[PDB]
Design an enzyme around this catalytic site. Structure first.
Site, PDB file in Angstrom:
ATOM      1  N   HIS A   1       7.485   7.386  11.334  1.00 17.70           N
ATOM      2  CA  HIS A   1       7.913   8.238  12.429  1.00 17.70           C
ATOM      3  C   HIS A   1       8.827   9.358  11.980  1.00 17.70           C
TER       4      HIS A   1
ATOM      5  N   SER B   1       2.114  11.323  11.345  1.00 14.82           N
ATOM      6  CA  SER B   1       0.892  10.972  10.647  1.00 14.82           C
ATOM      7  C   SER B   1       0.343  12.170   9.884  1.00 14.82           C
TER       8      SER B   1
ATOM      9  N   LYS C   1      -8.224   6.052  22.847  1.00  9.28           N
ATOM     10  CA  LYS C   1      -9.009   5.956  21.617  1.00  9.28           C
ATOM     11  C   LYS C   1      -8.765   4.624  20.898  1.00  9.28           C
ATOM     12  N   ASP C   2      -7.504   4.174  20.860  1.00 11.73           N
ATOM     13  CA  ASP C   2      -7.234   2.858  20.300  1.00 11.73           C
ATOM     14  C   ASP C   2      -7.800   1.761  21.175  1.00 11.73           C
TER      15      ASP C   2
ATOM     16  N   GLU D   1     -10.384 -18.123  -0.760  1.00 11.92           N
ATOM     17  CA  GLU D   1     -11.091 -17.499   0.344  1.00 11.92           C
ATOM     18  C   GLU D   1     -11.387 -16.047  -0.002  1.00 11.92           C
TER      19      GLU D   1
HETATM   20  C1  HEC Z   1       2.793 -21.065  13.400  1.00  9.03           C
HETATM   21  C2  HEC Z   1       2.625 -19.763  13.199  1.00  9.03           C
HETATM   22  C3  HEC Z   1       1.521 -19.136  12.330  1.00  9.03           C
HETATM   23  C4  HEC Z   1       1.534 -17.852  12.072  1.00  9.03           C
HETATM   24  C5  HEC Z   1       2.632 -16.913  12.592  1.00  9.03           C
HETATM   25  C6  HEC Z   1       0.394 -17.532  11.251  1.00  9.03           C
HETATM   26  N1  HEC Z   1      -0.317 -18.686  11.030  1.00  9.03           N
HETATM   27 FE1  HEC Z   1      -1.894 -18.701   9.701  1.00  9.03          FE
HETATM   28  N2  HEC Z   1      -1.922 -20.762  10.190  1.00  9.03           N
HETATM   29  C7  HEC Z   1      -1.074 -21.504  10.978  1.00  9.03           C
HETATM   30  C8  HEC Z   1      -1.412 -22.899  10.912  1.00  9.03           C
HETATM   31  C9  HEC Z   1      -0.674 -24.022  11.658  1.00  9.03           C
HETATM   32  C10 HEC Z   1      -2.448 -23.008  10.100  1.00  9.03           C
HETATM   33  C11 HEC Z   1      -3.177 -24.300   9.689  1.00  9.03           C
HETATM   34  C12 HEC Z   1      -4.129 -24.784  10.770  1.00  9.03           C
HETATM   35  C13 HEC Z   1      -5.469 -24.134  10.606  1.00  9.03           C
HETATM   36  O1  HEC Z   1      -5.799 -23.695   9.486  1.00  9.03           O
HETATM   37  O2  HEC Z   1      -6.216 -24.065  11.607  1.00  9.03           O
HETATM   38  C14 HEC Z   1      -2.780 -21.680   9.637  1.00  9.03           C
HETATM   39  C15 HEC Z   1      -3.794 -21.385   8.780  1.00  9.03           C
HETATM   40  C16 HEC Z   1      -4.083 -20.152   8.279  1.00  9.03           C
HETATM   41  C17 HEC Z   1      -5.203 -19.857   7.433  1.00  9.03           C
HETATM   42  C18 HEC Z   1      -6.267 -20.862   6.968  1.00  9.03           C
HETATM   43  C19 HEC Z   1      -7.250 -21.043   8.111  1.00  9.03           C
HETATM   44  C20 HEC Z   1      -8.264 -22.078   7.744  1.00  9.03           C
HETATM   45  O3  HEC Z   1      -8.504 -22.988   8.575  1.00  9.03           O
HETATM   46  O4  HEC Z   1      -8.820 -21.995   6.622  1.00  9.03           O
HETATM   47  C21 HEC Z   1      -5.165 -18.574   7.138  1.00  9.03           C
HETATM   48  C22 HEC Z   1      -6.182 -17.840   6.252  1.00  9.03           C
HETATM   49  C23 HEC Z   1      -4.010 -18.006   7.785  1.00  9.03           C
HETATM   50  N3  HEC Z   1      -3.368 -18.999   8.477  1.00  9.03           N
HETATM   51  C24 HEC Z   1      -3.609 -16.702   7.728  1.00  9.03           C
HETATM   52  C25 HEC Z   1      -2.590 -16.175   8.473  1.00  9.03           C
HETATM   53  C26 HEC Z   1      -2.186 -14.794   8.482  1.00  9.03           C
HETATM   54  C27 HEC Z   1      -2.918 -13.742   7.620  1.00  9.03           C
HETATM   55  C28 HEC Z   1      -1.165 -14.682   9.348  1.00  9.03           C
HETATM   56  C29 HEC Z   1      -0.292 -13.486   9.788  1.00  9.03           C
HETATM   57  C30 HEC Z   1      -0.107 -12.359   9.095  1.00  9.03           C
HETATM   58  C31 HEC Z   1      -0.899 -15.994   9.872  1.00  9.03           C
HETATM   59  N4  HEC Z   1      -1.785 -16.879   9.325  1.00  9.03           N
HETATM   60  C32 HEC Z   1       0.083 -16.288  10.776  1.00  9.03           C
HETATM   61  C33 HEC Z   1      -0.060 -20.994  11.711  1.00  9.03           C
HETATM   62  C34 HEC Z   1       0.351 -19.697  11.688  1.00  9.03           C
HETATM   63  C1  HEC Z   2      -0.738  -0.410   1.467  1.00  7.39           C
HETATM   64  C2  HEC Z   2      -0.902   0.488   2.433  1.00  7.39           C
HETATM   65  C3  HEC Z   2      -0.599   0.118   3.826  1.00  7.39           C
HETATM   66  C4  HEC Z   2      -0.671  -1.157   4.368  1.00  7.39           C
HETATM   67  C5  HEC Z   2      -1.080  -2.421   3.649  1.00  7.39           C
HETATM   68  C6  HEC Z   2      -0.288  -1.054   5.717  1.00  7.39           C
HETATM   69  N1  HEC Z   2       0.000   0.250   5.997  1.00  7.39           N
HETATM   70 FE1  HEC Z   2       0.228   1.163   7.855  1.00  7.39          FE
HETATM   71  N2  HEC Z   2       0.159   2.886   7.135  1.00  7.39           N
HETATM   72  C7  HEC Z   2       0.079   3.195   5.828  1.00  7.39           C
HETATM   73  C8  HEC Z   2       0.039   4.651   5.659  1.00  7.39           C
HETATM   74  C9  HEC Z   2      -0.047   5.394   4.351  1.00  7.39           C
HETATM   75  C10 HEC Z   2       0.100   5.184   6.892  1.00  7.39           C
HETATM   76  C11 HEC Z   2       0.080   6.654   7.243  1.00  7.39           C
HETATM   77  C12 HEC Z   2      -1.181   7.319   6.674  1.00  7.39           C
HETATM   78  C13 HEC Z   2      -1.400   8.691   7.264  1.00  7.39           C
HETATM   79  O1  HEC Z   2      -0.987   8.949   8.417  1.00  7.39           O
HETATM   80  O2  HEC Z   2      -2.004   9.575   6.606  1.00  7.39           O
HETATM   81  C14 HEC Z   2       0.167   4.045   7.817  1.00  7.39           C
HETATM   82  C15 HEC Z   2       0.240   4.234   9.187  1.00  7.39           C
HETATM   83  C16 HEC Z   2       0.392   3.167  10.034  1.00  7.39           C
HETATM   84  C17 HEC Z   2       0.421   3.288  11.437  1.00  7.39           C
HETATM   85  C18 HEC Z   2       0.297   4.565  12.231  1.00  7.39           C
HETATM   86  C19 HEC Z   2      -1.147   4.824  12.663  1.00  7.39           C
HETATM   87  C20 HEC Z   2      -1.962   5.163  11.448  1.00  7.39           C
HETATM   88  O3  HEC Z   2      -3.092   4.647  11.299  1.00  7.39           O
HETATM   89  O4  HEC Z   2      -1.515   5.954  10.588  1.00  7.39           O
HETATM   90  C21 HEC Z   2       0.592   2.048  11.949  1.00  7.39           C
HETATM   91  C22 HEC Z   2       0.680   1.698  13.411  1.00  7.39           C
HETATM   92  C23 HEC Z   2       0.672   1.145  10.872  1.00  7.39           C
HETATM   93  N3  HEC Z   2       0.545   1.838   9.697  1.00  7.39           N
HETATM   94  C24 HEC Z   2       0.844  -0.216  11.001  1.00  7.39           C
HETATM   95  C25 HEC Z   2       0.571  -1.091   9.947  1.00  7.39           C
HETATM   96  C26 HEC Z   2       0.533  -2.498  10.140  1.00  7.39           C
HETATM   97  C27 HEC Z   2       0.780  -3.225  11.440  1.00  7.39           C
HETATM   98  C28 HEC Z   2       0.231  -3.052   8.932  1.00  7.39           C
HETATM   99  C29 HEC Z   2       0.089  -4.488   8.632  1.00  7.39           C
HETATM  100  C30 HEC Z   2       0.992  -5.342   9.107  1.00  7.39           C
HETATM  101  C31 HEC Z   2       0.088  -1.922   7.981  1.00  7.39           C
HETATM  102  N4  HEC Z   2       0.305  -0.785   8.670  1.00  7.39           N
HETATM  103  C32 HEC Z   2      -0.227  -2.102   6.628  1.00  7.39           C
HETATM  104  C33 HEC Z   2       0.030   2.341   4.725  1.00  7.39           C
HETATM  105  C34 HEC Z   2      -0.163   0.990   4.860  1.00  7.39           C
HETATM  106  C1  UQ6 Z   3       1.974   5.565  15.090  1.00 12.90           C
HETATM  107  O1  UQ6 Z   3       1.931   5.413  16.503  1.00 12.90           O
HETATM  108  C2  UQ6 Z   3       1.911   4.089  16.809  1.00 12.90           C
HETATM  109  C3  UQ6 Z   3       3.102   3.430  17.073  1.00 12.90           C
HETATM  110  O2  UQ6 Z   3       4.277   4.111  17.004  1.00 12.90           O
HETATM  111  C4  UQ6 Z   3       3.102   2.086  17.404  1.00 12.90           C
HETATM  112  C5  UQ6 Z   3       4.407   1.389  17.675  1.00 12.90           C
HETATM  113  C6  UQ6 Z   3       1.912   1.394  17.468  1.00 12.90           C
HETATM  114  C7  UQ6 Z   3       1.830  -0.061  17.832  1.00 12.90           C
HETATM  115  C8  UQ6 Z   3       1.912  -0.999  16.653  1.00 12.90           C
HETATM  116  C9  UQ6 Z   3       2.380  -2.217  16.831  1.00 12.90           C
HETATM  117  C10 UQ6 Z   3       2.832  -2.693  18.191  1.00 12.90           C
HETATM  118  C11 UQ6 Z   3       2.482  -3.180  15.679  1.00 12.90           C
HETATM  119  C12 UQ6 Z   3       3.851  -3.866  15.733  1.00 12.90           C
HETATM  120  C13 UQ6 Z   3       3.698  -5.360  15.859  1.00 12.90           C
HETATM  121  C14 UQ6 Z   3       4.723  -6.148  16.084  1.00 12.90           C
HETATM  122  C15 UQ6 Z   3       6.120  -5.599  16.228  1.00 12.90           C
HETATM  123  C16 UQ6 Z   3       4.489  -7.633  16.200  1.00 12.90           C
HETATM  124  C17 UQ6 Z   3       5.285  -8.199  17.375  1.00 12.90           C
HETATM  125  C18 UQ6 Z   3       4.799  -9.589  17.705  1.00 12.90           C
HETATM  126  C19 UQ6 Z   3       5.616 -10.610  17.811  1.00 12.90           C
HETATM  127  C20 UQ6 Z   3       7.102 -10.461  17.606  1.00 12.90           C
HETATM  128  C21 UQ6 Z   3       5.060 -11.966  18.143  1.00 12.90           C
HETATM  129  C22 UQ6 Z   3       4.744 -12.055  19.634  1.00 12.90           C
HETATM  130  C23 UQ6 Z   3       5.630 -13.102  20.264  1.00 12.90           C
HETATM  131  C24 UQ6 Z   3       5.532 -13.431  21.533  1.00 12.90           C
HETATM  132  C25 UQ6 Z   3       4.518 -12.757  22.427  1.00 12.90           C
HETATM  133  C26 UQ6 Z   3       6.462 -14.485  22.093  1.00 12.90           C
HETATM  134  C27 UQ6 Z   3       5.794 -15.309  23.198  1.00 12.90           C
HETATM  135  C28 UQ6 Z   3       4.905 -16.334  22.550  1.00 12.90           C
HETATM  136  C29 UQ6 Z   3       4.841 -17.583  22.938  1.00 12.90           C
HETATM  137  C30 UQ6 Z   3       3.914 -18.494  22.189  1.00 12.90           C
HETATM  138  C31 UQ6 Z   3       5.651 -18.129  24.086  1.00 12.90           C
HETATM  139  C32 UQ6 Z   3       4.811 -19.128  24.886  1.00 12.90           C
HETATM  140  C33 UQ6 Z   3       5.623 -20.341  25.276  1.00 12.90           C
HETATM  141  C34 UQ6 Z   3       5.601 -20.824  26.498  1.00 12.90           C
HETATM  142  C35 UQ6 Z   3       6.426 -22.037  26.837  1.00 12.90           C
HETATM  143  C36 UQ6 Z   3       4.767 -20.189  27.580  1.00 12.90           C
HETATM  144  C37 UQ6 Z   3       0.740   2.046  17.223  1.00 12.90           C
HETATM  145  O3  UQ6 Z   3      -0.391   1.321  17.308  1.00 12.90           O
HETATM  146  C38 UQ6 Z   3       0.717   3.392  16.892  1.00 12.90           C
HETATM  147  O4  UQ6 Z   3      -0.471   4.001  16.638  1.00 12.90           O
HETATM  148  C39 UQ6 Z   3      -0.964   4.513  17.871  1.00 12.90           C
END
Ligand code: HEC
Ligand code: HEC
Ligand code: UQ6
Ligand code: CN3
Ligand code: PCF
Ligand code: 8PE
Ligand code: HEC
Ligand code: CN5
Ligand code: 6PH
Ligand code: 9PE
Ligand code: 7PH
Lengths: 42, 54, 75, 385, 248, 93
Positions: D202, D206, D228-229, D272
């Site tokens: 920011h 972009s 668009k998103d 994987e």
């Molecule tokens: C509790 C919070 C939780 C978060 C947050 C989470 N996972 Fe997982 N994930 C799990 C659990 C529990 C398992 C094992 C159960 C299963 O595999 O179904 C798992 C399993 C996995 C597996 C193996 C799945 C399979 O069955 O082979 C992968 C790959 C994975 N996670 C990737 C990710 C990635 C990538 C993210 C986020 C960036 C993420 N997980 C976030 C809970 C989480």
């Molecule tokens: C290794 C490279 C790379 C990774 C991995 C990456 N980003 Fe980016 N991201 C960028 C770059 C570079 C830009 C800006 C590129 C441009 O605008 O020309 C960007 C831009 C963005 C934007 C603005 C919209 C856009 O497409 O430019 C968002 C939202 C964003 N990233 C979120 C994420 C999130 C969420 C993840 C995963 C958690 C992620 N990024 C992982 C490099 C990365």
């Molecule tokens: C460049 O311009 C932008 C831009 O500025 C942004 C912000 C975004 C948006 C990007 C994002 C929002 C990515 C950021 C992602 C996060 C910050 C992840 C946040 C997620 C969490 C913190 C986890 C979510 C947690 C909950 C919802 C808590 C509730 C969950 C549970 C399980 C409670 C349930 C329990 C009971 C008892 C009901 C764009 O896409 C984008 O391009 C247009």
């Protein structure tokens, strides 16, 4: 060329505007997307 | 279309129309898709097998 | 007297000319190995010639043929 | 002023997703960022609602996963969304990093953004590996064993580091319990790094697919790039729904449904699908220590990228040879994955070594030489003397 | 590896539950359970399948109850701490024939028979692999293969040498519905039953997949319309440029 | 709040581009505009233009690496067969 002469939009304009028809069709389509999004969120 | 904006003018009645439409759509779509998915698999389900077993 | 469907299809597609030539190659291999396994020193060699690959060709031709028809001929 | 501008909380929502000035020429490749955000929210929410039924003992892990897939209402939806969404998370992240390499978003003034992106990439690989070991199948157990023995390659210290990681003497109950705790923990670090990523984005806005400035014709975020998103969000959910509901176990490896047996080694141990290029890079080096160093250098060589791109125009849009060698690189990365999926057999060793060399040569030799030649060719094409 | 260590490729049999709309054949699952109980269950556990999952799928309520009451499970002990048994109920699991691993390896020449709850989902090829494994034993191995004694040959197993016996012969079981029970019929029935045991959600998974793909395709086309709608002011925008007076 | 450094993007009003003069915009409301009038003839001819200018840079690397993978895989399944086992003996040692 003056800034009062608007360029050609006639290939992309509606032949009939009728500002309830167009807004009703647009709100129908946006409402259909909101309908299916409400079902999917449920 | 026409001159009816009692559905689209006010956002209260518009979002109420969208919610009532989705409320009907859930029931109708679920019943229709269950009927089609059982009609496409006539003879394979446990309903047909239990009706076949005397 | 309802025999199994799969060996019926396997004999029916061993009787075709590709099946006949392929079992000809396989029986020729088997006769090669049978005359290999009588000379002395056969217990102590570097390796053994076997008919795994000719049998793989024959079995692959037969089940590539009989895979789409078998569940038609089954209940 | 307006309430979305004067409030403390809504000013961030405003300046990020409502009134953010975006360049009006960006195509659908500038949508993978929003798509990664949505897929991260999917991973976290399914992880919580699936980790309410997971017991992380080594004698109760695989049985609890099958308890989720059998006894929990809609639990098959949760696990299949979770695993296949992790696969889509890495696929969208690979496409996002390829958008970064192609259009030159790594160049100045966006080096901080690129470095925070590489940090997010390393943390995501760590999260996926830990969660894959939490299943405790056959591939989970033996992959954990191979990766930690790779950590035992470190000289004079490494064996005690590995006995620290294992919490014992092999992959046992403390290993799986701490992998579940770390795997619950590291996605929140990923969320914090994502917020830092958005800040570093920011402060300059972009890029655009032309490589020129975009300060002239800006259009807001709201309704334009929101819808668009929304288009690509619905396409992503459609493809995810296909690979969850109609063919869920395609991307996984079937050996992972065998329970974890420390005595039986598998016929082919393979991670994987997305860690296979890195596994091929490591397997191509005939040394353990140099293999681990080369595997981490294959990610740090993305950090050495803005200092070698000597092209004076931003991005590969209007350059011929850089675009050609970019697609050489992309299909080389796919070939690394496919080499890694195979066995250690002739000629896959020699092809793995050549493919690793072309990877590092693209990041270190091909980009500066081709960018210099392209600069001189642009100059002498139009300047007459 | 050669093709011998990798095993022969199981072909594409046209199952009645392939395709994105076809479900399981529940009569085939019932007959597959019968062939399971009378052939496999001497030597294969089914540890992850409870009795209650068969109610309404392949058997009725009383049929599952009268099949579960033939077995004995561990009750809570009596008022003197003596261990006692009880007949089974709907909430218990299908018991294995062997009390532990060492009895299995003793009764099967060292080889451990794997639990068949997930065996069609834990092998590459799946249904085709299990069917070709069962119906794939030659009458005699190909010439030049020295089998270790106590092991058997079929080309579909990785390595060629399997420790299973050919246990599907003509009409060893009788079917309740009078279907001719050949080897291929019984193998098709048990492979369908094991597909049910690994994937009990399969029917509901495909119908919820139908609902989700329909709703998301409709949402995707509607969102394409709304994106082309709200960008119409920006796609059709035009710019003319008369260069300004240079005196300023 | 504290001041920050010089960025290359300002905000609405002081965005930081060059000063521009005599460049006029013209846009029509989308309510009086027909959307998706340019899908037919467009998704044929413009899509063929976008494919023709842009396919060969993708098709030559795919061709090179797919031919190289196919030749390597064919040589693999040659030398782990019965015909090339002595060649496997001499190149594996
Ligand atoms: C509790 C919070 C939780 C978060 C947050 C989470 N996972 Fe997982 N994930 C799990 C659990 C529990 C398992 C094992 C159960 C299963 O595999 O179904 C798992 C399993 C996995 C597996 C193996 C799945 C399979 O069955 O082979 C992968 C790959 C994975 N996670 C990737 C990710 C990635 C990538 C993210 C986020 C960036 C993420 N997980 C976030 C809970 C989480
Ligand atoms: C290794 C490279 C790379 C990774 C991995 C990456 N980003 Fe980016 N991201 C960028 C770059 C570079 C830009 C800006 C590129 C441009 O605008 O020309 C960007 C831009 C963005 C934007 C603005 C919209 C856009 O497409 O430019 C968002 C939202 C964003 N990233 C979120 C994420 C999130 C969420 C993840 C995963 C958690 C992620 N990024 C992982 C490099 C990365
Ligand atoms: C460049 O311009 C932008 C831009 O500025 C942004 C912000 C975004 C948006 C990007 C994002 C929002 C990515 C950021 C992602 C996060 C910050 C992840 C946040 C997620 C969490 C913190 C986890 C979510 C947690 C909950 C919802 C808590 C509730 C969950 C549970 C399980 C409670 C349930 C329990 C009971 C008892 C009901 C764009 O896409 C984008 O391009 C247009
Ligand atoms: C694999 C799992 C990933 C899961 C992620 C799900 C999302 C997939 C994203 C794929 C993608 O983003 O590619 C974008 C690519 C470039 O887009 P562009 O801006 O240059 O084209 C402008 C468009 O005409 C504007 O046209 P418009 O904007 O009006 O509609 C666009 C289109 C939406 O389609 C997509 O978003 C991509 C399929 O609406 C339709 O008419 C669809 C008709 C059925 O689109 C293309 O035009 C295709 C070019 C080749 C790309 C091949 C990709 C192979 C990897
Ligand atoms: C997270 C996903 C949750 C999805 C739940 C969807 C709930 C219904 C959303 C669709 C809906 O009803 O939107 C209607 C309103 C207004 O939408 P609009 O048509 O753009 O506004 C014009 C208002 N008129 C002039 C027609 C009166 O739109 C709104 O009030 C905006 C709601 C946006 C919710 C996100
Ligand atoms: C460790 C670091 C991570 C590295 C990641 C490695 C790559 C991961 C693979 C992800 C696939 C991403 C493909 C590349 C994405 C960027 C491509 C792109 O920018 O598309 C635009 C490109 C040219 O378009 P222009 O912008 O130049 O048009 C201007 C008009 N004058 O248009 C084109 O030239 C055509 C684009 C077609 C994409 C083909 C994708 C091939 C995917 C692999 C297929 C594997 C099966 C063989
Ligand atoms: C003679 C005892 C015996 C009977 C009866 C028996 N099995 Fe086996 N089965 C085995 C043994 C032993 C193994 C282990 C094979 C091995 O590990 O090499 C096995 C393994 C298998 C495997 C896995 C093979 C592999 O390579 O992964 C399947 C599938 C299988 N049996 C199916 C069945 C089915 C279906 C039945 C019922 C028709 C059945 N078996 C009945 C002894 C038996
Ligand atoms: C397209 C997706 C649609 C889906 C809808 C869900 C999307 C929700 C996204 C919300 C994004 C909000 C998170 C962004 C964020 O936390 O960054 C805050 C950084 C503020 O610092 P700055 O950018 O320099 O702003 C200017 C500031 O320096 C003003 O100084 P001060 O007033 O102190 O503010 C500092 C805030 C401190 O908090 C944090 C976290 O940094
Ligand atoms: C944190 C997670 C990040 C996920 C990235 C998602 C990026 C896209 C978000 C889309 C939000 C749409 C809001 C538009 C809006 O309110 O416009 C409002 C009204 O628009 C609408 O009513 C849109 C119809 C309802 C669409 C509902 C979509 C819900 C499905 C979301 C699936 C992803 C969560 C303002 O529109 P206007 O300024 O043109 O008048
Ligand atoms: C994951 C987030 C990480 C950190 C990033 C911070 C960004 C947070 C985004 C939150 C967006 C939604 C927040 C909407 C709240 C706006 C309401 C409001 O500001 O009204 C406030 C009062 O707020 C409250 O009392 C409750 C706020 C709790 C918020 C908990 C979510 C009105 O206060 P006002 O600004 O008018 O000041 C007048 C002083 N008397
Ligand atoms: C919390 C993030 C979850 C995002 C899930 C996206 C992945 C797509 C697969 C979804 C399948 C799971 C749902 C399901 O099985 O429903 C099935 C129906 O399919 C759908 O409607 C899914 C449409 C998805 C629309 C997404 C709307 C956005 C909501 C944001 C959260 C409020 C089952 O329906 P039923 O239980 O019979 O009512």
């Amino acid at each position: 060329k003056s800034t009062y002469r608007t360029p050609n939009f006639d290939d992309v304009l509606k032949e009939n505007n009728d500002a309830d028809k167009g807004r009703s069709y647009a709100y129908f389509m946006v409402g259909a997307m909101g309908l299916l999004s409400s079902a999917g969120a449920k | 279309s026409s001159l009816y904006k009692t559905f689209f003018k006010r956002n209260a009645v518009f979002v109420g129309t969208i919610f009532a439409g989705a409320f009907v759509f859930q029931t109708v779509f679920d019943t229709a898709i269950t009927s089609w998915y059982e009609n496409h698999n006539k003879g394979k389900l446990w309903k047909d097998v239990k009706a076949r077993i005397a | 007297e309802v025999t199994d469907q799969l060996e019926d299809l396997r004999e029916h597609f061993k009787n075709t000319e590709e099946g006949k030539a392929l079992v000809h190659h396989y029986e020729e291999c088997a006769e090669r190995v049978k005359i290999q396994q009588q000379q002395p020193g056969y217990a102590d060699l570097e390796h053994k010639e076997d008919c795994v690959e000719e049998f793989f060709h024959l079995q692959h031709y037969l089940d590539t043929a009989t895979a789409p028809r078998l569940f038609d001929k089954l209940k | 002023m307006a309430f979305r501008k004067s409030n403390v909380y809504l000013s961030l929502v405003n300046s990020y997703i409502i009134d953010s000035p975006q360049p009006s020429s960006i195509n659908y490749w500038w949508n993978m960022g929003s798509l990664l955000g949505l897929c991260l929210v999917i991973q976290i929410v399914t992880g919580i609602f699936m980790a309410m039924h997971y017991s992380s003992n080594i004698e109760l892990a695989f049985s609890s996963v099958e308890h989720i897939m059998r006894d929990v209402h809609n639990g098959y939806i949760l696990r299949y969304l979770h695993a296949n969404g992790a696969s889509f998370f890495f696929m969208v992240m690979f496409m996002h990093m390829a958008k970064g390499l192609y259009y030159g978003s790594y160049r100045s003034p966006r080096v901080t953004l690129w470095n925070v992106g590489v940090i997010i990439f390393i943390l995501t690989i760590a999260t996926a590996f830990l969660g894959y070991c939490c299943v405790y199948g056959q591939m989970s157990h033996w992959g954990a064993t191979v990766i930690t023995n790779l950590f035992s390659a470190i000289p004079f210290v490494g064996n005690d580091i590995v006995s620290w990681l294992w919490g014992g003497f092999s992959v046992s109950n403390p290993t799986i319990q701490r992998f579940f705790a770390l795997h619950y923990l590291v996605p929140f670090i990923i969320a914090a790094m994502v917020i830092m990523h958005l800040m570093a984005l920011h402060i300059h806005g972009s890029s655009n697919p032309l490589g020129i400035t975009g300060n002239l014709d800006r259009i807001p975020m709201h309704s334009y790039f929101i819808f668009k998103d929304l288009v690509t969000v619905f396409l992503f959910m459609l493809i995810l729904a296909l690979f969850v509901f109609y063919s869920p176990n395609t991307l996984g490896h079937p050996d992972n449904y065998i329970p974890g047996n420390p005595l039986v080694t598998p016929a082919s141990i393979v991670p994987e699908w997305y860690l296979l290029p890195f596994y091929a890079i490591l397997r191509s080096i005939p040394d353990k220590l140099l293999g681990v160093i080369t595997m981490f250098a294959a990610i740090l060589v993305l950090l050495v990228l803005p200092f070698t791109d000597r092209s004076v125009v931003r991005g590969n849009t209007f350059k011929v040879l850089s675009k050609f060698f970019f697609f050489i690189f992309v299909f080389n990365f796919v070939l690394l994955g496919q080499i890694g999926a195979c066995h250690v057999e002739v000629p896959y060793v020699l092809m793995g070594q050549i493919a690793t060399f072309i990877y590092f040569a693209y990041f270190l030799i091909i980009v500066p030489v081709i960018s210099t030649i392209e600069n001189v060719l642009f100059y002498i094409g139009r300047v007459n003397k | 590896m050669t093709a011998a260590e990798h095993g022969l490729h199981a072909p594409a049999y046209a199952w009645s539950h392939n395709g994105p709309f076809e479900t399981f054949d529940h009569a085939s699952i019932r007959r597959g359970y019968q062939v399971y109980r009378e052939v496999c269950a001497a030597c294969h556990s089914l540890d992850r399948v409870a009795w209650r999952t068969l109610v309404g799928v392949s058997h009725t309520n009383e049929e599952v109850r009268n099949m579960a009451e033939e077995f004995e499970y561990d009750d809570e002990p009596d008022e003197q701490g003596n261990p006692k048994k009880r007949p089974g109920k709907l909430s218990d699991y299908i018991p294995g024939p062997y009390p532990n691993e060492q009895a299995a390896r003793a009764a099967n020449q060292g080889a451990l028979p794997p639990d068949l709850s997930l065996i069609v989902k834990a092998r590459h090829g799946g249904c085709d692999y299990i069917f070709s494994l069962l119906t794939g034993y030659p009458d005699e191995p190909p010439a030049g293969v020295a089998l270790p004694p106590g092991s058997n040959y079929n080309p579909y197993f990785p390595g060629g040498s399997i420790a299973m016996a050919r246990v599907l012969f003509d009409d060893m079981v009788e079917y309740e519905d009078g279907t001719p029970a050949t080897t291929s019929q019984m193998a098709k029935d048990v492979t369908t039953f094991l597909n049910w045991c690994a994937e009990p959600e399969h029917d509901e998974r495909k119908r919820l997949g139908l609902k989700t793909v329909i709703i998301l395709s409709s949402l995707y086309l509607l969102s394409i319309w709304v994106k082309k709608f709200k960008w119409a002011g920006i796609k059709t925008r035009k710019f003319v440029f008369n260069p300004p007076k240079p005196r300023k | 709040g504290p001041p920050s450094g010089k960025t290359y993007m300002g905000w609405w009003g002081h965005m930081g581009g060059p000063k521009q003069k005599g460049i006029t915009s013209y846009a029509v409301s989308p309510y009086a505009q027909k959307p998706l009038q340019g899908i037919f003839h467009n998704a044929v001819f413009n899509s063929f233009r976008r494919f023709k200018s842009q396919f060969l840079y993708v098709l030559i690397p795919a061709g090179i690496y797919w031919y190289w993978w196919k030749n390597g895989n064919e040589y693999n399944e040659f030398l782990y067969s019965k015909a090339g086992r002595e060649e496997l003996e001499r190149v594996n040692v």
